[PDB]
Amino acid sequence: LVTIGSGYIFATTGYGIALQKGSRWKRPIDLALLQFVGDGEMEELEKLW
Amino acid sequence: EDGYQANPKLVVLLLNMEREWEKVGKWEAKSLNMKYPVWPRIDSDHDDNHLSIVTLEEAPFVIVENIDYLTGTCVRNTVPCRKYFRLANSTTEGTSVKKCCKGFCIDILKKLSKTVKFTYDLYLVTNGKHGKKIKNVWNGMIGEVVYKRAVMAVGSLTINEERSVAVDFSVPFVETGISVMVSRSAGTVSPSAFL
Amino acid sequence: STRLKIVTIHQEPFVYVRPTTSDGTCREEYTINGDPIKKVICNGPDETIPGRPTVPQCCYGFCVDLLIKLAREMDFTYEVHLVADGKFGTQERVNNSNAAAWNGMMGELLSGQADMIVAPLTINNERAQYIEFSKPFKYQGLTILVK
Amino acid sequence: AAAWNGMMGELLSGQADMIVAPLTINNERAQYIEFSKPFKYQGLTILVK
Amino acid sequence: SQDCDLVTTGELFFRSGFGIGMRKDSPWKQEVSLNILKSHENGFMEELD
Amino acid sequence: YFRRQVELSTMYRHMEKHNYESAAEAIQAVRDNKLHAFIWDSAVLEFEASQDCDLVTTGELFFRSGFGIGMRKDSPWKQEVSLNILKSHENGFMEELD
Amino acid sequence: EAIAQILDFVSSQTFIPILGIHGGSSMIMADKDEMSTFFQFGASIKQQATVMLNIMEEYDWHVFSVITSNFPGYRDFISFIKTTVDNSFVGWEVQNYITLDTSYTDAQTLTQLKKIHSSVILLYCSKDEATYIFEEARSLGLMGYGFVWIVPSLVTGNTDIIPYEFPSGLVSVSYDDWDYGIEARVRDGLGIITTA
Amino acid sequence: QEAIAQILDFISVQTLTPILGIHGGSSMIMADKEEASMFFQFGPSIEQQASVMLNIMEEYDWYIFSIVTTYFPGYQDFENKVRSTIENSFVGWELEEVIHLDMSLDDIDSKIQNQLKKLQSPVILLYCTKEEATYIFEVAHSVGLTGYGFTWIVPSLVAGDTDTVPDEFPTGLISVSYDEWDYDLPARVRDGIAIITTAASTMLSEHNSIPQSKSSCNNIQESRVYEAHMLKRYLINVTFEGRDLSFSEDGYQMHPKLVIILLNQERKWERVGKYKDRSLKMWPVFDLYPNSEEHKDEHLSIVTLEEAPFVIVEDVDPLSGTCMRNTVPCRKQIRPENRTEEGGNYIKRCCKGFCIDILKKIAKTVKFTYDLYLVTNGKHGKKINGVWNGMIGEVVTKRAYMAVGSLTINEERSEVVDFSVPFIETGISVMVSRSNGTVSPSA
Ligand SMILES: *[C@@H]1O[C@H](CO)[C@@H](O[C@@H]2O[C@H](CO)[C@@H](O)[C@H](O)[C@H]2NC(C)=O)[C@H](O)[C@H]1NC(C)=O
């Protein structure tokens, strides 16, 4: 089984997490997340899973 | 060896909020029983501690398998998981306990236990998987986010504007799009144009 | 105010920057598709030649077409200029007194001179702590260019 | 709770004063007993085809 | 792709995504994203790229 | 390693449930094709790899270790032994035997 | 609490079978002597802890502290935790592991206790000691969230009376009277005697 | 007494006549001088002292610290000065807590005790009045904060007079103070007067105008007293004997000699070290910084040699002072090549790599502190004639306890010194390139 051509999906999106509209644990949550992007582990998780 | 009943007849008692030993649970034979599956919250909610959250299970983000019932325990590098055994018609929510969860989201959640320092409760959705909107009322994890059953919903869920009016996400961790997997082949044209 | 201030930066193919014509307007050009290439007059900073910091120039490209769409869609007017000191934006810790993330294009925004940044501006934790980023137009990763 | 037994416990036990075998050298064992300098440096691989 | 005398190294690292920028109290923030999402779903974004 | 590596707990059990009393049976399972894969150290295994060879070793050796004699503590000879085997390396004896 | 031991002492000399159906006699006691004694109250404290562990298994991991503070099994309780941990079937671990109370400044134990930072406090001290411990915990900050208390019969025994200062919400658990009648226990035992 | 200087600041404000002081209370650290006020204090600026505290901590490489302060003057800035000084540096040192407290009503002890009890940090900077220091120390003695492994560091004010020291202060207390030679009327006045005459010298040069003014507070201040304002700069720029009295904006001397002092056993104040210019002389006067037992945290001076990849010597940034991040310092006396004796200033090149990393990892488990330097003579241990050479010599001379590096193992060295189990596979080998491939027609 293979992807289409190169594999560009043609629909562009990334995963997201819900929060109560009123809730903003996310603005605070965001900061932790980026460094996580920057951190090598995302790629470890990539390699992991 | 204490001359005591071999199978202890035991009951679990919690020191209650107002000087009371509310019956936390009872112990019968080998099995351990707690009357309330959910963990009680002391006083007022503090620090969004143990916020309820259900993460959708899929190959990409989370994965569920049974706990090692031979030991009665969940795998060390996984997370012990719960769900509500379906009983929609029934008054009871139902209990779908003892299932372990895997995946990088699960691992991120571990990162988050430490990072945002917040305890969490995780369960599985029953009606509709990823939110489905039909007529007046929406369905899925989004429903439990709207109903106040769930604070945050986690999974392979895609982002859309409608979800955006209702709720929000600031992460965008992985690149995903609609796609097709085909078994296909390519072939020579004009025998290298006869050289 | 309907009128808006936009700061951008030279970075092909998202933002091309060319001199206006003698009469001060942008040369009419056509894309491969055949639709007229939309251009906007963007204040330009210092040129390759000595001095000449103040200039009127022509801007167009991916990000410019996006701006035009956003402006038409949310119904707002704007004025575009190229960022002072030619940079995207990073905080500098200790040049004399402790300093902010006022470096390049990003600081300009902090000052309030620019009300919106429309360019290939990477969304990251450092910047998100101080400004608001919209949903990312594109997903990209760093690579290496060689001969 | 028990001694490692087998070849090693017999050794602790004194059944065999000295153990001559192709045995890998590790810290968990090492606290309990003295070990000579290691003769070979073999590494785990997966033997299948 | 435009200059054939130049080439990229194969590895892609530090995966990251670009975005529009506004002050946190901008009244156009809610509108700016909804528009971006609509353009992605509509295909406008694909036309430009 | 699987024990201490909580990271490998999954694998620890996955592995445990299929374990053998000895190499003869463990090699045989792969040979018999009862088990698709077998995990063990190099000194005992490679010689067998040469011996039959239908089977193959793969990847990079992990968790390196050097073989040594095991003796009860305080053995007044271990040190001498160490010197002796050291000499065995020095004079190429160890090497010659291998 | 003391009463059981006393009657037990009589048992060692007399050799007359004795048992008890309610209250303190039913309450646990230190390890039985080689000569058989009276013994209905006693239960494997280890077992008792495994009961508690089941609760810990459901909601408790990396317990804050297990301390051999007072009465029987300070040394004995210490081993089992190790025995429980020794199986290594799951991923168990400990953070706090000390003893002591009354003889000197509580502080040597307290400063050590300050060092531990964990989820569930394990208690093996009498209600009297516990009374003081309650006083200690409030100053200590153990009473605050993230420091659950696991309490045995050592304290739990006074069902009728709970020291107000007892920072509630921590699990206190032992046998309950309504479930089984006190009078009910005696006939059965008599029957057992008959069958013996 | 500290308060006298403050009163004098008020007086400066009142009469606009320059005043300075060479000893004692006038000398003690004070609140940043109001700009209008004109005054001279014989002590090192609060910021400067904080800097010295940081240098001292850096010298012993105590990265993790907390600050206990009181509402006493300059407390807020102290935090600010530290925030800049600590912040600028690349290193990841940690500030644990900052505590601001005062005794109010009947609960200051409760509140202070509850507030102080949380702290766990090894290195404490304290700032307060001397007496307050007495109370805080009694409280610390109750709290157990004074005891071994925790250490306290103090600015000038608490030490006060050298002669008087309530033993309420814990021993091993580390604090900064002015040089004793400086603390004599003889020179502080000689110096002060010289400063006055140089200020007057500049009265001759700048404007050819007499500085003399009516001194009475009761009488209306002279209008031409105003001019003295400009006169202050000359005042600030005062030097004599080729020595700087130069002040700083706070009014403390701009370049004042200073000594690192510790409380020696019992009642003695012994200067552990001395500070000259930019450089810090962290002198280990007290070799054993550990109370009760010499054996605890046993010293393990270590010698190594540079080889790639394992042990790599790198030159530290000149601008970015001291080793950065991972590199660990290694010093070998800078032996002059020309000098036969070759007595040397220890080198400042940072060793880093796999060998260093292994030591760093092992050291944490071991929890033993250590000093690392580079070998000079013989490189890898060698037996030449009847005598050994290299790091092994320093192991034999007991100039090194343990030697680390790419060092191989052999029977002779195992005979003379016990060796760790080898962590790597190595040996003799060859490095060359193959010329060609053989063809056999066997297809
Ligand atoms: C303190 O005063 C001395 C003496 O005037 C200053 O040294 C002179 O600085 C001037 C700057 O214009 C130079 O031209 C002279 O060459 C220096 N030495 C002389 C005058 O021979 C010094 O600069 C002053 N310190 C400060 C605060 O700058």
From Swiss-Prot, chain A:
Belongs to the glutamate-gated ion channel (TC 1.A.10.1) family. The chain holds residues 739 to 787 of 1451 of the full protein. It is found in: Cell membrane; Postsynaptic cell membrane. The gene is grin2a. Component of N-methyl-D-aspartate (NMDA) receptors (NMDARs) that function as heterotetrameric, ligand-gated cation channels with high calcium permeability and voltage-dependent block by Mg(2+). MDARs participate in synaptic plasticity. Channel activation requires binding of the neurotransmitter L-glutamate to the GluN2 subunit, glycine binding to the GluN1 subunit, plus membrane depolarization to eliminate channel inhibition by Mg(2+). NMDARs mediate simultaneously the potasium efflux and the influx of calcium and sodium. It comes from Xenopus laevis. Heterotetramer. Forms heterotetrameric channels composed of two GluN1/zeta subunits (GRIN1), and two identical GluN2/epsilon subunits (GRIN2A, GRIN2B, GRIN2C or GRIN2D) or GluN3 subunits (GRIN3A or GRIN3B) (in vitro). In vivo, the subunit composition may depend on the expression levels of the different subunits. Contains an N-terminal domain, a ligand-binding domain and a transmembrane domain. Agonist binding to the extracellular ligand-binding domains triggers channel gating. This is Glutamate receptor ionotropic, NMDA 2A.
From Swiss-Prot, chain E:
Glycans are attached at E31. The lineage of its organism: Eukaryota, Metazoa, Chordata, Craniata, Vertebrata. This is Glutamate receptor ionotropic, NMDA 1. Belongs to the glutamate-gated ion channel (TC 1.A.10.1) family. NR1/GRIN1 subfamily. It is found in: Cell membrane; Postsynaptic cell membrane; Postsynaptic density membrane; Synaptic cell membrane. A hydrophobic region that gives rise to the prediction of a transmembrane span does not cross the membrane, but is part of a discontinuously helical region that dips into the membrane and is probably part of the pore and of the selectivity filter. Component of N-methyl-D-aspartate (NMDA) receptors (NMDARs) that function as heterotetrameric, ligand-gated cation channels with high calcium permeability and voltage-dependent block by Mg(2+). NMDARs participate in synaptic plasticity. Channel activation requires binding of the neurotransmitter L-glutamate to the GluN2 subunit, glycine binding to the GluN1 subunit, plus membrane depolarization to eliminate channel inhibition by Mg(2+). NMDARs mediate simultaneously the potasium efflux and the influx of calcium and sodium. Heterotetramer; the NMDAR subunits are modular and harbor tiered domains that function in concert to regulate opening and closing of the cation-selective ion channel pore. Forms heterotetrameric channels composed of two GluN1/zeta subunits (GRIN1), and two identical GluN2/epsilon subunits (GRIN2A, GRIN2B, GRIN2C or GRIN2D) or GluN3 subunits (GRIN3A or GRIN3B) (in vitro). Does not form functional channels by itself.
Curated annotation (Swiss-Prot), chain H:
Residues 1-443 are extracellular. Detected in oocytes. It comes from the Eukaryota. Disulfide bonds join C323-C350, C330-C351. Zn(2+) binds at H23, E180. L-glutamate binds at T408, R413. Glycans are attached at N237. It is found in: Cell membrane; Postsynaptic cell membrane. A hydrophobic region that gives rise to the prediction of a transmembrane span does not cross the membrane, but is part of a discontinuously helical region that dips into the membrane and is probably part of the pore and of the selectivity filter. Component of N-methyl-D-aspartate (NMDA) receptors (NMDARs) that function as heterotetrameric, ligand-gated cation channels with high calcium permeability and voltage-dependent block by Mg(2+). Channel activation requires binding of the neurotransmitter L-glutamate to the GluN2 subunit, glycine binding to the GluN1 subunit, plus membrane depolarization to eliminate channel inhibition by Mg(2+). NMDARs mediate simultaneously the potasium efflux and the influx of calcium and sodium. Belongs to the glutamate-gated ion channel (TC 1.A.10.1) family. NR2B/GRIN2B subfamily. Heterotetramer. Forms heterotetrameric channels composed of two GluN1/zeta subunits (GRIN1), and two identical GluN2/epsilon subunits (GRIN2A, GRIN2B, GRIN2C or GRIN2D) or GluN3 subunits (GRIN3A or GRIN3B) (in vitro). In vivo, the subunit composition may depend on the expression levels of the different subunits. This is Glutamate receptor ionotropic, NMDA 2B. The chain holds residues 100 to 546 of 1448 of the full protein.
